[PDB]
Design a protein around this nucleic acid. Structure first.
Ligand SMILES: C[S@@+](CC[C@H](N)C(=O)[O-])C[C@H]1O[C@@H](n2cnc3c(N)ncnc32)[C@H](O)[C@@H]1O
Length: 327
DNA sequence: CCATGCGCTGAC
DNA sequence: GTCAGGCATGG
C-alpha cells in the first residue's frame, strides 16, 4: 500500500461489507474515511479482522435487517466471486453464493449512501452474455445511481500480480458527479523478486518434484508479465512454475495443485510456493498487517482479498470527485 | 478440517 | 497454435 498525503475522504463514514481481511477498510481509512460497520460471516476471517481492527464483524448479511445498518456515505462490497469465476461452474444468480448483490441493493435502497463501491472478477463483465453486468447496472440506475464499471489489472498500478478485476463505482444522482475517472496505469517497477522473504524463512515451502519439466530459460531482465518456466504433472492450476523476475499469477482462495493458491516460483535454483507474508505483499498489504495463525486460512484469505493499492487510487478519485463543488 | 489432481473455460 | 483462471473426492 501507498502513502496518501491528501486525505480526500476525511469526514466520510463507510461500511465494510463482505469484509474478509478488511482490504477496503485499509484503503478508505488511508484516505481519511471512518469505518462505522463491517460484516463478514466466515469464523476465521472474523478472527483475523478482530486481530487487526479490534472488532468482530456481524455475521450472515442475508439475515441482517437493513434498517439496523448505521448511516454511511460509502458502501464497500467485494462480493463473492465463486459463482462468476472462469475457474468454476458459472451458475451466477442460480448459485447461493451468486445472489449477494441483491443484499447490497436491499441495503442501498434503505440507507441511500453517496457512493457504492463494488468489486468482482473480470468475468463478471462477460458472464451470461453480459446480462449479469446489465442487471447490476439496471438495478443501480433504478436506485437513482450512475454506474461506472472498468476491469483493472493490478500490474498497471505498482503491484506485481496479474489480477484482473471489475470495479464498479456508483454515485447517487443528486450529487451530479460528472468527473469520476478510473486511475491511469503507470509503469511497474516492483517484481516478485522484490517482495520475497530471505531463503532462511521459507525452506519449508520448497517442493522438489521428480516430474518437474523446465520449459523455458530463466530471465535476467525484469518484465511486467507472468513468465512460466516449467510445469509439474499435467500443468493444471497449481502445477505451473514462474520466474520471480516477472509478476505473480492471480492468488486464489479455493485453488488446488501441488503449488496451491500461490503458484510455484523458481528461487535460487529451487521451486517453492509463496509464504503468507509474501501473499500479503503481492496483495499490497503492509507488513504491519497481522496474518491469521492458520497458514491454511491465511492463504485462503489473501486469495479471496483485494489489491489494496488499486482500491487506494480509486478511493482517492471518488474523494476527488465528491470534493469538486464549484459555485 | 486439509490436500491436491484435475477439467475445462476464457482468451488469445 | 500459445497460455491462465474453482470443484471433487480422498484422507
Ligand atoms: C471473495 S471475498 C472478499 C475479500 C475482501 N474484499 C478482502 O479485502 O479480503 C468474499 C467474502 O465474502 C464472504 N461471504 C460469502 N457469503 C457471505 C454471506 N452470505 N454473508 C457474509 N459474508 C459472506 C466470504 O467468506 C469471503 O470472505
Amino acid at each position: 500500500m501507498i502513502e496518501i498525503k491528501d486525505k480526500q475522504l476525511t469526514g466520510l463514514r463507510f461500511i465494510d461489507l463482505f469484509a474478509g481481511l478488511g482490504g477496503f477498510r485499509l484503503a478508505l481509512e488511508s484516505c481519511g474515511a471512518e469505518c462505522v460497520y463491517s460484516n463478514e460471516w466466515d469464523k476465521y476471517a472474523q478472527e483475523v479482522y478482530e486481530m487487526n481492527f479490534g472488532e468482530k464483524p456481524e455475521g450472515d448479511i442475508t439475515q441482517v435487517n437493513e434498517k439496523t445498518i448505521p448511516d454511511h456515505d460509502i458502501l464497500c462490497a467485494g462480493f463473492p466471486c465463486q459463482a462468476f469465476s472462469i475457474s468454476g461452474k458459472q451458475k451466477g444468480f442460480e448459485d447461493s453464493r451468486g445472489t449477494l448483490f441483491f443484499d447490497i441493493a436491499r441495503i442501498v435502497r434503505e440507507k441511500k449512501p453517496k457512493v457504492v463501491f463494488m468489486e468482482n472478477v473480470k468475468n463478471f463483465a462477460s458472464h451470461d452474455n453480459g446480462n449479469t453486468l446489465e442487471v447490476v447496472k439496471n438495478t443501480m440506475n433504478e436506485l437513482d445511481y450512475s454506474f461506472h464499471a472498468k476491469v483493472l489489472n493490478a500490474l498497471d498500478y505498482g503491484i506485481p500480480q496479474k489480477r484482473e478485476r471489475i470495479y464498479m463505482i456508483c454515485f447517487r444522482n443528486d450529487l451530479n458527479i460528472q468527473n469520476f475517472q478510473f486511475p491511469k496505469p503507470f509503469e511497474l517497477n516492483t517484481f516478485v523478486k522484490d517482495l520475497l522473504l530471505p531463503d532462511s524463512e521459507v525452506e519449508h515451502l520448497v517442493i522438489d518434484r521428480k516430474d518437474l519439466v523446465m520449459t523455458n530459460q530463466e530471465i535476467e531482465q525484469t518484465t511486467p508479465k507472468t513468465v512460466r518456466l516449467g510445469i509439474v504433472g499435467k500443468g493444471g492450476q497449481g502445477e505451473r512454475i514462474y520466474s520471480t523476475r516477472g509478476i505473480a499469477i492471480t492468488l486464489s482462495a479455493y485453488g488446488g495443485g501441488i503449488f496451491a493458491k500461490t503458484g510455484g516460483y523458481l528461487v535460487n535454483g529451487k521451486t517453492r510456493k509463496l509464504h503468507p507474508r509474501e501473499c500479503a505483499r503481492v496483495m499490497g498489504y503492509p507488513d504491519s498487517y497481522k496474518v491469521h495463525p492458520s497458514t491454511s486460512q491465511a492463504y485462503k484469505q489473501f486469495g479471496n482479498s483485494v489489491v489494496i493499492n488499486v482500491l487506494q487510487y480509486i478511493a482517492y478519485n471518488i474523494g476527488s470527485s465528491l470534493n469538486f463543488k464549484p459555485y
